Every structure is written in structure tokens, then in C-alpha cells.
Amino acid sequence: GAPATVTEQGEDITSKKDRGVLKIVKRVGNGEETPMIGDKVYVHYKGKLSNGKKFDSSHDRNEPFVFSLGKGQVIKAWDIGVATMKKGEIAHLLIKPEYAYGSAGSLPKIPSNATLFFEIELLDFKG
Ligand SMILES: COc1ccc(CC[C@H]2OC(=O)[C@@H]3CCCCN3C(=O)[C@@H](C3CCCCC3)NC(=O)C(C)(C)N(C)C(=O)COc3cccc2c3)cc1OC
């Protein structure tokens, strides 16, 4: 499945080069601009525990998810990952626990020491 292909083939997009955030581009975006630190970002997403049978279904797929990039409003992996995405891009991210919920997790849905998998679609961004 996609987590194994991303662990196998994914690009390391970390500063540390610890393969803690691994990326495969699923749909090539528009042009060359990526969102910048402090921009509002608008995405759709699907997340799961990387071992997980199905994507989590507990958010509205219609409504864009919105956050301010690089401001610690999301797990570290998203501040890293989304910054790399072109408008219209769909990417896969495979994330080690130190770029997600670490030792604490976030019970019940996210256990301690959880590796996560996302599909993200970058819809738009604005300064
Ligand atoms: C700076 O560090 C953090 C900042 C914010 C948080 C709160 C959780 C945060 O969730 C996320 O960052 C990620 C990525 C953005 C989409 C939602 N996130 C999820 O982890 C998913 C998760 C993926 C694994 C499968 C189970 C679900 N969570 C969600 O999809 C749900 C709907 C379950 N969830 C509670 C939220 O999306 C709550 O809304 C958020 C809004 C902003 C940031 C976070 C969550 C946690 C942080 O560190 C642990």
C-alpha cells in the first residue's frame, strides 16, 4: 500500500535528514510558487495511523481545513510538508512520531509513538 511505497520511495523533506517526514507527489500542482511562512493555507486531507485499515472519516470532506503555515498551529510534519507543496498539488506524507504526537500521543485516536500517513490537497494560500 501507499505507506510502504512512501517509506520505500518517498523524498526526505526534513532539515535533520532523519526520514521523519517522507513525501510522494500524487498530483503535480500549478507553477512553482509554494506557500510561505505566515500564509493562510487551505487544504483537503485524509489522515490515518500508518498501520490503519482505512483513512479517518471524522472531519467534513466538503469544508477546507485552514491554518497559518509555519506558526505551530499543526503537527511539525504539516508545517514542513505543506510548505513544499504547489497550489493544486496532492501529496502523500509518512510521518515518524517525533514530527506528530510523539510519546504523549493524543488518546484515544492517537496512541503513544504513532507513525501517521496523510493525503493532502493544497487548494489555495494567501499572504
Ligand atoms: C504544534 O503542535 C501541534 C499543534 C496542534 C495540534 C492539534 C492537532 C492538530 O492535528 C494535526 O495537526 C493533524 C494535521 C492537520 C489535520 C488534522 N491532524 C490530525 O492529526 C488528524 C488525525 C490524523 C491521524 C488519524 C486520526 C486523525 N486529526 C483530525 O483529522 C481530527 C478531525 C481527528 N481532529 C481532532 C482535528 O483535525 C482537530 O482539528 C485540528 C485543527 C488544527 C490542528 C490540529 C487539529 C497538535 C500539535 O502537536 C502534537
Numbering used by the authors: 13 to 139
Wording from the paper:
As intended, the interactions of the pipecolate, the A‐ and B‐rings, as well as the cyclohexyl group with FKBP51 were completely conserved in comparison to previous FKBP51‐SAFit co‐crystal structures. Strikingly, we observed that the carbonyl group of 13 a, 13 d and 13 h displaced D68 and replaced it as a hydrogen bond acceptor for the ϵ‐hydroxy group of Y57. The rearrangement of the β3b strand is stabilized by an inward flip of H71, which partially replaces S70 and substitutes the former as a hydrogen bond donor for the backbone carbonyl of Y57. Representative macrocyclic compounds 13 c, 13 e and 13 h as well as SAFit1 and ‐2 all dose‐dependently competed with a fluorescent NanoBRET tracer inside cells. For 13 c, 13 d and 13 h, the apparent maximal inhibition was already reached at the lowest tested concentration of 1 μm, possibly reflecting the higher affinities and/or improved cell permeability of 13 c, 13 d and 13 h compared to 13 e and 13 i.
The larger homolog FKBP51 is a regulator of glucocorticoid receptor (GR) signaling and has emerged as a potential target for depression, obesity‐induced diabetes and chronic pain. The most advanced FKBP51 ligands are compounds of the SAFit class (Selective Antagonists of FKBP51 by induced fit), which bind to a transient binding pocket unavailable to FKBP52 and are up to 10 000‐fold selective for FKBP51 over FKBP52.
